[PDB]
Structures are given as C-alpha cells and as structure tokens.
Design a protein around this nucleic acid. Sequence first.
RNA 1: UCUGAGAGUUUGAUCCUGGCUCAGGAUUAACGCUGGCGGCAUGCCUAAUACAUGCAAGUCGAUCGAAAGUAGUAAUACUUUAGAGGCGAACGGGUGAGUAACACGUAUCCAAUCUACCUUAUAAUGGGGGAUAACUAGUUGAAAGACUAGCUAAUACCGCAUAAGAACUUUGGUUCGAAUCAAAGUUGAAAGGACCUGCAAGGGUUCGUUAUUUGAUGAGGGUGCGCCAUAUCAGCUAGUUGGUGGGGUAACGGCCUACCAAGGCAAUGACGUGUAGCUAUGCUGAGAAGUAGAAUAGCCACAAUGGGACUGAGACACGGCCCAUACUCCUACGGGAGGCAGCAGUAGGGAAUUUUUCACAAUGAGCGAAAGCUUGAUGGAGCAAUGCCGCGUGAACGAUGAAGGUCUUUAAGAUUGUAAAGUUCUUUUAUUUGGGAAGAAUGACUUUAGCAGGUAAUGGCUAGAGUUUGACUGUACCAUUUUGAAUAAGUGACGACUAACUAUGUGCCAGCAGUCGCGGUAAUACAUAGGUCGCAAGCGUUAUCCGGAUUUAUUGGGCGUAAAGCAAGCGCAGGCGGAUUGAAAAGUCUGGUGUUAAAGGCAGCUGCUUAACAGUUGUAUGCAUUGGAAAC
Lengths: 77, 87, 67, 203
Amino acid sequence: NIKSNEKRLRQNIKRNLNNKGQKTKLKTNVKNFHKEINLDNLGNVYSQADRLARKGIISTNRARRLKSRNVAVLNKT
Amino acid sequence: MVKIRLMRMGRVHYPTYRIVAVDSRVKRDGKYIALIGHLNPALKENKCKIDEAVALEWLNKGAKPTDTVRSLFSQTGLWKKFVESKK
Amino acid sequence: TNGFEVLTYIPGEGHNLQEHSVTLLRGGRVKDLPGVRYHIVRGTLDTVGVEKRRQQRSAYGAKKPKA
Amino acid sequence: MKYTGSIFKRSRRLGFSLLENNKEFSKGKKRKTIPGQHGNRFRSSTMSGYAQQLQEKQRMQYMYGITDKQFRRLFRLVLKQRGNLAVNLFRVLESRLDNIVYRMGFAPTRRSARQLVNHGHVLLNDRTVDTPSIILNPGDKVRLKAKTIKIPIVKAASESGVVSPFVETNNKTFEGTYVRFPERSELPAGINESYVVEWYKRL
RNA sequence: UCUGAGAGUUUGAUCCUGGCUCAGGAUUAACGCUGGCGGCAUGCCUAAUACAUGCAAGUCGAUCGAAAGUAGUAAUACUUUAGAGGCGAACGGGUGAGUAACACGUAUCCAAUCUACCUUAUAAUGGGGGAUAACUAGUUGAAAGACUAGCUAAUACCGCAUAAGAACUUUGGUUCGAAUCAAAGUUGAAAGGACCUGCAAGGGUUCGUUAUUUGAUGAGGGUGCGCCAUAUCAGCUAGUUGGUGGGGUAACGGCCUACCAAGGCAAUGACGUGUAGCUAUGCUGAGAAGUAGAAUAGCCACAAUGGGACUGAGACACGGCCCAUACUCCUACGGGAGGCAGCAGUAGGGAAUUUUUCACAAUGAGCGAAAGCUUGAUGGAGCAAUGCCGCGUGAACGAUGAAGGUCUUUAAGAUUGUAAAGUUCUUUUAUUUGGGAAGAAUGACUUUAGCAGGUAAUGGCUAGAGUUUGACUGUACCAUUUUGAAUAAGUGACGACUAACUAUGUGCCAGCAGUCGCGGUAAUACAUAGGUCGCAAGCGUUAUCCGGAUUUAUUGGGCGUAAAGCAAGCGCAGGCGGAUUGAAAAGUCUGGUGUUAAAGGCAGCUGCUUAACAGUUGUAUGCAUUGGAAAC
C-alpha cells in the first residue's frame, strides 16, 4: 500500500454521499414529472439537471437527452 | 499538452537528440506526429539545425517547449517571429 | 529429466557408469547399434572423462596435460 | 593469433617469396621442397581447384600479415562499392597503413614496420595512429611523427629504400604520401588474385 | 537495373527414377578445452511458479486553519506540515496466460462520438449559508485503532441575485438530416491567494474561477480487404433473425425491456478441435518467397484467481475500494496483514541466462509562481568470451643449420630450423609520474540595458554578467613520464568428399564415425608420438531456421515398364468454351491526389584514430479515391 491512495479513500466517500443525494433528488423530481405533467414541474427538472451539469456527477449528454425526452412528452399537445 | 521535448537517439556516451513534437502522455523515444530537426549536444558551433517549417505550425496550434528547447528557440530567433505574429 | 527413456552409447576407453549415477546426455547417431541414438557428454557431472587422453582433448573430457 | 611462428616455411610450402627475392635465395643452402618430414616427393598428385585456390588465398594473406575474419570483412567492404573486383580489392589491401609504411621503405620488414606503427611511432596527416587497418586514400600525407628517429633499425632502411612511383617520400624529413593507386604489374605477380576473388561465393 | 556454382551415396559396370547426407550463413544458444586487453550490442526461451529482504509518484504554505519550533518586551517576522484542499495518480515499468477475432495490419466513415491540463478570442471573477478535519474530553486496546460529545477556516460544500452567448423546446421563413438566421419560454455562473498603487475612494499586476468560440490532442464506435491447420469436425444458432413501444447508453444498436412472427449463418467450410498475442522486422533466398515474431517500436490483453461498483473527464484502476476463492505471514488466541510478470535478490525447474550497485550529472515525467522535491523510468558503473569488431603474445640481424625429438635405420643426412642460442631496438598493452577534458558552448537565478502591449507602478521578450550545476570520474585521453622482451595461445583435422602423413602399440579387441566405411598380427581412419595443415581469443560438438532441395515444381515436376489414369458409364454444382455488331467498363492498362510512424534494409554522406558503431538525406511497396483507354 502507498500513502497517496487511502487519503483519496477518505476524500471520495463524502462526495460519493453528496452525489448520491443529488442523484436521488433528480430521480424523484423526474418521477414527479411522470405522475403529473406541467411546465412548472419540468422547469424544476431542467434547473435540477443543470445543477449537476455544472459538475461531473451526471454526464451532460445524459442531461440533454433526458430533458429532450421530457419535452417529447410535453409535446403531447 | 503536446510538448516539444528531447529524444536521446544514439549510442552509449553519445546522446544525439532529434527534437520531437510529442504529446505529454507519451514515454521517451516514442512515436510522434511530426519531426523537428535534430541535435548533437556534443558538437558545438551550430550543430543544431532545425527545420523551422512545421515547428512554427505546432507552436501556432498548441505546443510547449522545454528548457533545452527554450535554448534552441532562443538563438535561432523563434521568439521574435512567434510572439509578435501572435498579436 | 522428463519421462522419456532412451538407449545411449558411452564414448571413450572405459567409463564410470554407477547404476543410478546421474549423467548428462548428447545427441548423435550410431550406425553400429540400431535403436541407440545418443551419447554421453563425457566430463560431465558424474561420468568422469577418460584419462590419458591428449588428442583433441574435448570429447572424452580430458583437461590440458601439464607440459 | 595475429602473429606467425615461422616465415620461411610459409614460403617453402606456398612457393612464394614472403620477402622480395631472398626468401629462398640459398640462405644456409635454402631449399624449395615442402616443409615437414615428407618433403621428398609430393610434387603434384592431387592438384585440385580447391587446393590451388586455398594456395592463392594463403599466398595473398600471408605476405600481408592478415587473418581470416578481417580479410573476409575487407572483401565484403570492397564488394560494397562499384568497379572492377580484383584490382579494387588489391587497392584496398595496398591502402593498409603498415603496408604503406613498408612501401615507404622506412623499415626492413613489415613486422618491424607494424610494431613501429602499433607502438605510436607513426603519425599520419598530423594525427597519431594505433590501428594498422586505417584506409589510406589518394593525396594523404604521412610523416614519421618527427619523433623516435634514433632507432638503428629504421635508419638503414630510411636511407636505403626503394621509392616506388605510386607512393612518394622525402628521406630526410621522413615524410611520405599516397598519391596514386599501385598497378597490378607494379607489385609482385606471383599471386593470381583472380582465383582468390572468385574463390568467395560467400555473399 | 538486380542477379542462379556443387558433391558423395543403390551397380560386376552404365543411364535414369528416387531418398539420405555434406560443402554456406544465422542463434535470447548451451557443453568440452583454452582464455590477455579494448570498443559496441546482448544477457530465463523452462514456472502468467512461490517468494526472505531493501527501494520503485508524489508534489504544493503565495490554498486553509491549526499545531510544533526560532528571533521578539510586545507587536510581529521566519522554518516544517500531522490534517483539510489542488493536481498527479489512468502516464511511465513488467509479462505474453488468454484471445483464430474488426484482436492486428491497413483504407476508410463517424449525418453517431466525446476529449481537463494545451490553443484563438468574449462575458463576467457579486453577496450569503451551513457544515468537518485537526484539537480537546471520554470509552476503549500494548499498538494498529475505533467509537461517543463540543470547537473551527478555506481555492471543501450548498442555496440567492443578473446571465454576452450558450443548453432545450415553441413559431417563421433558408440550403442540398445537416446549418445558419429572427422572435418567445425555461434553466443554470465563480473563489479567492500574492503583489503594486491608493491617506483614502479606488485603480491595476501576477496567480486563480465559471460560462463561452475555434482548434490541437487522446480515446471510442463501424465497415472493406488481408490476417492458421483440421471434414478421422455436417449441420449450427432461439436475443439467435426481423419489426413495433419504452428505457438505457458519450453515441448507433435485441443492449435490455413489453408485444408479434420464425427466422438467420453454413461446402466459397458454418459450429468444433488444437494452435498462437498481431504488425514493422530479424535469418535465409536472385526471386516468387520459406521461417521466428530476440533487443526495440505501433496496436492489443493482464495484474494471486473470479466478479462488482464508487470517484475521477479519462479505471472497472499493476504498488485504489468491496466481495468471494486459494496460498502465505505475524500475533499478547483477543485479532490482523499481504499480493516481486517494477529494480535487485532467494527457492525450485532447467543444461542455461547477472549486482539485494551509484546519481538525478543529462532527457523526461509529476508537482510546485520559486527555491525545490520523487523517479531501481533514465543516465551510469559491476558481472558474462554470449555475439561483432580492433589490438597485443614482440622486432632487426642472426647457420651447411646449436642441442634434443622424430624419421632415415643406426657411423651418411633430412625435419624441427633463422625456428633456436646470441647482439641490438621499441613499449599500445604491463607499470610509474604529471597534466587532464567534452559531455553542462544547456538551462534555471537575479541584479543590469533596452524593447515592446498596458499603465502609476508592476511583470514577459531580447542580449550580456556572474556565482553557478558531474554519479559518471583524475574518466578517457594527452604529455621525448619510470622500468622492462619483458605482462599474454590455444584449438580441429590429416582415407576420400575437403587443404594436411610417417612411426610405435592394438590385432573384429579395445575404439572411430556427417556419408562412404575402418581394425580377425605391416591400420596414413583405432590409442599415442613426431610432423603437417584449417581457424584463433576463441576453436570444436550438439540443438533450431533458410539454402542447396526444381525434394510440393505459380515462376518451376510427372502419371506405359521406375511412386502415380479411379473398372466403366449417366451426370447436378463448378472450371473452361464458335464467329459478328453496339453499349456499359468489373477485371485489364495508364494519369493525378491522399495515404502506407520511427528505427531497421539499400545508397550516398557525416562523425567516431577506422571497421564494430552512432547519426543525416534520398530510396521502394500496397491500398483507397479520382481522369481517361476500350484489344481482350
């Protein structure tokens, strides 16, 4: 074992927890948008996705793909 | 970052460097894209001719010289034809 | 050193085969003996080379004699 | 080994004077039979092409003081270039520094000349040499280092020396030059170089 | 313009068919014998067997608080970071087990992709919140620790304000799904450190932040063609084939999913078997090419074995994590720890393949404004005749010819043999002395001097200056430096192939042998002696590859009697196939373009005292695409 790996073992855990907390709130917002459809809910979804789009938690192309498939169901009318 | 580095091509006790336009994540004396003159840093008095053709292109589309490459870029006047054409 | 068993002819004048003596082998055909297709490197681990050898001194494992 | 034991026996069997003409010039009632206990009658009974070709090979390389592998390297190197084969090969063999020292006449024998060359007594083109296999080209200047002239063996050769026209020298200043390539008829012709040159199908 | 050598062996003797063997090179070679030096290269191919042991990627205080230490009366200033935080850790090292396939070579498209540090250019670098290391106290153990409660700061995190343009959709028209415009809606941006200036106000510089617009770069996906044997492997495959809706993914996609149908690959070799990292290249060949994939380089795969996933932009991570499996080690029986195929080294195997060696001096990489740090990458030294090359073991003179040996057979002589003895000469090497490099005509370092974007200052650029930096290493090397022929030769054969012949002994016995074959009392083949010759610091033997071998015959073979025409016939598929006219143009030929890494091969040249060797320039080849031609 080398010293400069278990330090990374400490740093990774807290941001892992934080990123999981963000991912699950993205997911619950997306579930909210399925169960009821309106501009406000999906706008919250756009904002919530862009929060992580700043960072490297979610791949940005995933964010755009999901918001595109959500405007797709917005286009029901 | 693509770096202009040195490549010790030669026998023991006799380094003979070809100046190389190589990426940062490449080992010593590895494959590269374009060739930049050569060097024999044992013979003095202008034994260090360089192409001057594609090196300026490399610098103009991203390149990072090193201290021994800084030396060669100094005498030949690469700086006075590079940093002014930069503006 | 593997599982193979081979016939083998000894060189020289006399030998030191010792009935479970560890030896070393050498190729080479022998016309006189059908089946036998090998020789012993003489001068090896156990089979001591033939003494009183002064011509070419390489086969039969004899060192350079004192002048 | 780079040195040979006996030299007159070589001329005996090879039937070629290692010296100019004194190899078998009745020195101690000098003879011409083959050496060993069996010089009585082995005149010519198994004269094969291979036998005589070996004969010319050994004749060619004994009077030059060479050994096999370096001679093979010389043949390969001379084969690398373009021109005629035998004469260029002989030019390369006459481009040896010690052979040119002998042709200078500064030493009585090629062996003494070779020792003097090895021991640093010879300086070439204002550069000291220690390799008897240097390749001399036309227009190359030679001196005797301007040093170690006080040798009894170098003197009587230095004044008494045959100045061949293909290499010129100045006796007192001990300066020489390799101006022109020696000609086939200029050097001893008891060697049939052809049988040697097509004796090598090595490449 | 390149270039093609044979020979012995079946017979009483001959010609032919035909097989074997030798004459040539080459090795990651080993063994026997011998062994002086120098230079260059190379050094487990067996066990991807297991490992004692030491070192292999860390850096940063001009990020943070705090701790410790030093000068200080204090204020304060300086040195290190245990920890938090930034980057690096995914490169670089090693090995070739697996993999017979888009793994590789190679040509391509990604209207299917993404890419931080690097690059052009733009907008802003505002203000708050809430947290936690360390610390303390406790529990607790020898320690590793772990857990419990309070305390903190940041370039750690999270909201809020406005988004230049983005991101995505809404509407309109544009062009041959792409791209660009206009308007609308929703949505998201930071972090400050150091410094100059400024009484201040505030302005600015350097380092830093986010969003942006080109790229460079790297990675990934797909296709063409090529890239082993085997039919003593005939069927193989059910996410398999195709469609529909959704999800998923950097993106395409049965990738998955819910529904429907049974399809698809296969004699032009499916599926299976065994084999193997592929390529450049090495050895051989004149060549078509045979052959191994050495050092090394591009690509690929792996990290005791088998799975999983976080984080990171990039790993499913060689010295990161979890789990399981097997092995081992330590212990205070409570528990732990590990993964040498990194550099050395050990055990085993093997016939066999090395120092538990020095230094960042140079290249480099990483961090750090900068000093500087780490580097068993790298550069060096030690060992090894393992290979290639060079140099030595002296030299001149010196005889009817010293002595001895052998033969002759002895009482002639010849060989040894100018070889020797002897007289003189020099010293690479041997051994002293003194001088003593280049590599480091680099670079960082900051005073200087100026320029130049912008100012008040600050910082870069250009030239100089200096102290500077060597393990190598007093190294090579040089210098009429000391002495001294002194400090250095073996090896194989001598019947023929194939240069080299006599004697003694042995007497089908001991033994020799690549082939022919030698010896049963005169052996040039056995053993030795003498002599001779072939190589020589190497010589021989064995093992493997190509050649000769036209002995797998495409170049380049035959089938009556030498191996070889099926017992014959009907015949699918396939191969080949009359003449004439036109078209297209796959082949076929030629024109352009792109491409086919370096090293290596060839040739020239340059530099090593010269080859060995190092370097420079030029040099083929194939493929894709594009213009033609139109005999066949």
